[PDB]
Design a protein around this ligand. Sequence first.
Ligand SMILES: CC(=O)NCCc1ccc(S(N)(=O)=O)cc1
Ligand SMILES: CC(=O)NCCc1ccc(S(N)(=O)=O)cc1
Lengths: 265, 264
Amino acid sequence: GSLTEDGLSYKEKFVVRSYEVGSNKTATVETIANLLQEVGCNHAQSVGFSATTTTMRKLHLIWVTARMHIEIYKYPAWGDVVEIETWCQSEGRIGTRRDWILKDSVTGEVTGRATSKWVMMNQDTRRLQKVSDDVRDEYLVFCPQEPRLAFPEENNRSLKKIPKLEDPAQYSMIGLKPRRADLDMNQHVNNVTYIGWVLESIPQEIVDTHELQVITLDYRRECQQDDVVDSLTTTTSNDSQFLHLLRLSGDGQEINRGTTLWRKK
Amino acid sequence: GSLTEDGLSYKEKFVVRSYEVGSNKTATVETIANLLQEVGCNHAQSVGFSATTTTMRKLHLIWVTARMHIEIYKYPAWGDVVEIETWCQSEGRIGTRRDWILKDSVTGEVTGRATSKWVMMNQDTRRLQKVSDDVRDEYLVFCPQEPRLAFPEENNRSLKKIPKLEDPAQYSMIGLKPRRADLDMNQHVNNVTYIGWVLESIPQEIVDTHELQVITLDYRRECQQDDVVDSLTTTTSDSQFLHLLRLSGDGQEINRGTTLWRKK
Ligand SMILES: CC(=O)NCCc1ccc(S(N)(=O)=O)cc1
Ligand SMILES: CC(=O)NCCc1ccc(S(N)(=O)=O)cc1
């Protein structure tokens, strides 16, 4: 992988592995989400990090995911090479955004795109806060100054408000729990695990006859290593749409909400 | 990746990814096991299975894993490049073996080794059988003819008999179930999932103070997509453990194994 000429974005190529693909012999959406995290991490390393700015480490502040939106037009097949470009942007005092574009390395065509919103949190108290003047200054040195959006359209799916699923859910998968492979190097549940858990409550018949086109996830609370989760889904709709809710198995505390759009094969 | 000069083994390099490492910022044993499957698959593709031989497809025969043994001396760190070499061998009518050697790409030093035993099964009836002359002849064309072993030592850990854990287990993790990410492209539970489930019943304190050096797994029955599993572990001792995976309801054995851990 490498930073581009202007030093304001990063590109990396990945060969899709045998264990990374589903029944259609193309990369799962969780494989795509893991590749997005990996190219994001390689970009942060290339621009000097170990993207928590200098003032953030002094103030015990970290970035946490508020929303993730992914749209895939074609999933890369096993053995294919996919090129992913990523960049960051400051969104004033609200937070930051990381965007990605996925292309078929052979044709150069866009096969997918993604965007994520991140908010600042105190690592100790877990209290959210606005981005201060000093943090914005440090973050702006490796971002494009003019807006550069993976989803530019002035009425796009990535900015839609998601409602809370009301009981009873049409479908459910109960008693989901993370194992060590679902944790990251800091022993937190990896964000991609929540995508997998959301998808567990979609009927196998939809998965067999449809391809996932869009997924939007709204992160509300972090699942602990010893937590147990229920995944709920209700159909809202040649396209099928669903509303999703992840909540703790016991008290029902919301952890995530989202929506998915599927197109008939 | 590429076949070697003689066309009898295959090598591939992998850069360890951020999501592939554990709390020590080195690759987990499940990441290593997935890389072993991937280099094995690239080798099979390079030798013409673009490794079920021509006569196996006509007879509805497939290879299934009987045992997996992995020994790691050093886990590669996040961002490091690891080179893995793999090859296969016919073991008469018993079955076949796939072996692997892992090296640090910068130093050329051996950092790990693995070996796996495979037996022939009818895909429809699920009945096991001996390999047969025609299948051995077809398999021998891409294998070394003289023995080449990742574990040559005459009484090494990869060939030890594993006993059945007796109740009560010292530790347990119950109600484990596979999700779609644990399945392979044919909707079967990926073999690496069983390594993860075995490790779930090891106390977090051992994981925090020790590094896993050796794991041996004996595969007895396949876990279905809708099955639920219990993972049991008892200390037999470095720390050593005996493991058992069984179905949560009736207690049908699915796997048994052992692990050896070295103090950090
Ligand atoms: C007060 C408050 O909301 N704090 C943020 C806690 C917090 C919520 C969600 C996540 S995530 N992206 O892992 O789902 C992390 C931390
Ligand atoms: C009669 C008999 O044992 N048939 C083999 C069944 C069989 C057992 C185990 C596995 S594995 N490698 O997925 O754990 C697959 C198939």
